[PDB]
Design a protein around this ligand. Structure first.
Ligand SMILES: CC[C@]1(O)C[C@@H]2CN(CCc3c([nH]c4ccccc34)[C@@](C(=O)OC)(c3cc4c(cc3OC)N(C)[C@H]3[C@@](O)(C(=O)OC)[C@H](OC(C)=O)[C@]5(CC)C=CCN6CC[C@]43[C@@H]65)C2)C1
Ligand SMILES: CC[C@@H](/C=C(/C)[C@@H]1C[C@@H](OC)C[C@H](O)C(C)(C)[C@@]2(O)O[C@@H](C[C@H](OC)[C@@H](O)C(=O)O1)C[C@@H](OC)[C@@H]2O)CO
Ligand SMILES: C/C(=C\c1csc(C)n1)[C@H]1C[C@H]2O[C@H]2CCC[C@@H](C)[C@H](O)[C@@H](C)C(=O)C(C)(C)[C@@H](O)CC(=O)O1
Ligand SMILES: Nc1nc2c(ncn2[C@@H]2O[C@H](COP(=O)(O)OP(=O)(O)O)[C@@H](O)[C@H]2O)c(=O)[nH]1
Ligand SMILES: [Mg+2]
Lengths: 69, 429
């Protein structure tokens, strides 16, 4: 009976520790994915805007080439 | 000789306090532990339940346990609350939440050793300790879960002393809490294996007596508990007062328990009469005797007419001729001999004590060991399986570390216990 009483108390302690552990890890991994995902959405949008700045400058060089004739 | 008394949880401390209140009055002890009695008959056996302190002060050999302070203050601030030894209060703060697992395995685990220390200190102060008595309910968390944990630990340190409990079974007529059949079933399992004698005090029976017989339209625990203290005083008369019986707890077990597992007693008390025009009539021994055996007077909600008595002990108190008592008791047996098994000759015994309970000229106390007590365990078993069939409310207990198997083997043990009673109900010579 005494081995079993310790068994039970230690199992209660273990289930509470595992509950804390999984919440801790699930939260951590969700913050991580969101950081990556949001930063990538912004990088994509900004990468696109610069690709337009590239085209504008090419539109300026294009104007001078025709400007010498 | 000496008995160590333990009360655990709300119910146990409630009825435990009324018990000391009542027997203290009988032995002439006032709330400050001074003796103010006339007869010396009240001090002949006072050491059975009281320790003698310096200055002619008698202090109950009582240990008060609870997992929450509430009832501790309540007892300590009540009538006869100052009489108790202040070291013998052992309480926590968490409470058990009416959860057997908290009382037995998690929260009670921390407090239990403190109780064993007080238990040990009282036992060593005894000339020749005969055993222990515990008051508790089975429906809650502390008295049920931690009370049985205490029994188990105490049995391991005193394996040959007598272990005796006054155990209150739960009833839906009195209580609201859905998990009580769970707590009671786990408790009954511990009681069949680790106690020698258990008085089954059924809240279902106490309620019917107060509501039907006594006509109490708004019964309180004070009403129920005043029935319990009267019965507890009655069943302990032959320990606390001398006369014609050279009997202790072991002798009572030997002659009351013919098979180890069948040690659950059905108690009863007479007189019981509703207010108030009949409260002034004089009681005759024939009337006391008929009332004592009446099924509606039993303090476990089970019909003794449905089964057979293995053994019966009856105790009468007050001024009365033993001849009348003898004749009346023999009348009941000779005229209803089919309700007593014939393979145990002369299996109903009587004791008479001169001192009557307070307020009564006469009284009788009934201790029956009857196969019909199975009805009590069947009732609790039905409530248990209705819930357990679907694992309902199980998470309160598995969250404390318990397994389902522990529930399965508790219900299993109780079902076998039922079977055993049934087999001597049909056993013949
Ligand atoms: C002895 C201790 C006790 O006082 C006994 C009863 C219950 N409680 C506290 C007090 C109490 C009672 N009723 C209350 C209503 C609201 C708040 C408190 C109460 C009490 C009463 O009326 O006299 C004081 C009582 C309670 C019940 C009670 C009887 C009763 O006093 C007669 N019933 C036996 C049950 C009950 O469930 C039942 O089976 O029907 C009779 C009953 O149902 C009905 C329809 O009455 C009822 C009444 C509220 C309903 C739901 C919950 N159950 C639990 C027990 C039961 C009750 C008395 C503890
Ligand atoms: C004793 C064995 C076992 C059952 C039996 C047989 C017992 C016998 C005797 O018990 C006191 C009854 C007794 O002989 C009487 C008939 C005079 C009497 O007292 O009966 C009770 C009614 C009681 O209801 C419960 C009855 O059914 C009962 O319990 O009978 C009131 C009234 O009824 C008319 C009558 O005054 C109980 O341990
Ligand atoms: C029935 C009684 C006495 C009696 C029967 S015949 C007679 C002359 N006296 C006693 C019984 C005592 O064992 C004690 C339990 C009783 C509980 C009562 C306190 C109950 O709560 C209350 C409603 C009562 O019945 C009375 C206060 C009227 C009580 O005096 C009568 C009674 O039952 O006590
Ligand atoms: N007879 C009686 N039963 C009680 C009393 N107090 C509580 N109970 C019953 O005991 C059960 C609850 O146990 P309780 O003692 O309150 O819980 P614990 O403190 O955890 O041991 C229920 O069945 C209640 O009806 C009381 O004073 N008298
Ligand atoms: Mg409570």
């Amino acid at each position: 009976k005494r081995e079993h009483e310790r068994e039970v108390i230690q199992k209660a302690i273990e289930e509470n520790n595992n509950f804390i552990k999984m919440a801790k890890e699930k939260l951590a991994q969700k913050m991580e994915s969101n950081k990556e995902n949001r930063e990538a959405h912004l990088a994509a949008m900004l990468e696109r805007l610069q690709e337009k700045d590239k085209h504008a400058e090419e539109v300026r060089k294009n104007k001078e080439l025709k400007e010498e004739a | 000789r000496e008995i160590v008394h333990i009360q655990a949880g709300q119910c146990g401390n409630q009825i435990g306090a009324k018990f000391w209140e009542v027997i203290s009055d009988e032995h002439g002890i006032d709330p400050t532990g001074s003796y103010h009695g006339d007869s010396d008959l009240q001090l002949e056996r006072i050491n059975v339940y009281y320790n003698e302190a310096t200055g002619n002060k008698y202090v109950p050999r009582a240990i008060l346990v609870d997992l929450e302070p509430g009832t501790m203050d309540s007892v300590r601030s009540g009538p006869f609350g100052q009489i108790f030894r202040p070291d013998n209060f052992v309480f926590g703060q968490s409470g058990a939440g009416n959860n057997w697992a908290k009382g037995h395995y998690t929260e009670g685990a921390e407090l239990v050793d403190s109780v064993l220390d007080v238990v040990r200190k009282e036992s060593e102060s005894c000339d020749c300790l005969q055993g222990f008595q515990l008051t508790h309910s089975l429906g809650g968390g502390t008295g049920s879960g931690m009370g049985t944990l205490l029994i188990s630990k105490i049995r391991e340190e005193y394996p040959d002393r007598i272990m005796n409990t006054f155990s209150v079974m739960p009833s839906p007529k009195v209580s609201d809490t859905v998990v009580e059949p769970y707590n009671a079933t786990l408790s009954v399992h511990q009681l069949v294996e680790n106690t020698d004698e258990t008085y089954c005090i059924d809240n279902e029976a106490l309620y019917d007596i107060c509501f039907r017989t006594l006509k109490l339209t708004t019964p309180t625990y004070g009403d129920l508990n005043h029935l319990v203290s009267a019965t507890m005083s009655g069943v302990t008369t032959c320990l606390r007062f001398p006369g014609q019986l050279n009997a202790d707890l072991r002798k009572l077990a030997v002659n009351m328990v013919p098979f180890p597992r069948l040690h659950f007693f059905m108690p009863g008390f007479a007189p019981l009469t509703s207010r108030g025009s009949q409260q002034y009539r004089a009681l005759t021994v024939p009337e006391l005797t008929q009332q004592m055996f009446d099924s509606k007077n039993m303090m476990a909600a089970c019909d003794p007419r449905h089964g057979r008595y293995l053994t019966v002990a009856a105790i009468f108190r007050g001024r009365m001729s033993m001849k009348e008592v003898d004749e009346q008791m023999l009348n009941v047996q000779n005229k209803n001999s089919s309700y007593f098994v014939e393979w145990i000759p002369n299996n109903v015994k009587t004791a008479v004590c001169d001192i009557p309970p307070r307020g009564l000229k006469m009284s009788a106390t009934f201790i029956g060991n009857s196969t019909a007590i199975q009805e009590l365990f069947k009732r609790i078993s039905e409530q248990f399986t209705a819930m357990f069939r679907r694992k309902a409310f199980l998470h309160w207990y598995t969250g404390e570390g318990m397994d389902e198997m522990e529930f399965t083997e508790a219900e299993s043990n109780m079902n076998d216990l039922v079977s055993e009673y049934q087999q001597y109900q049909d056993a013949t010579a």
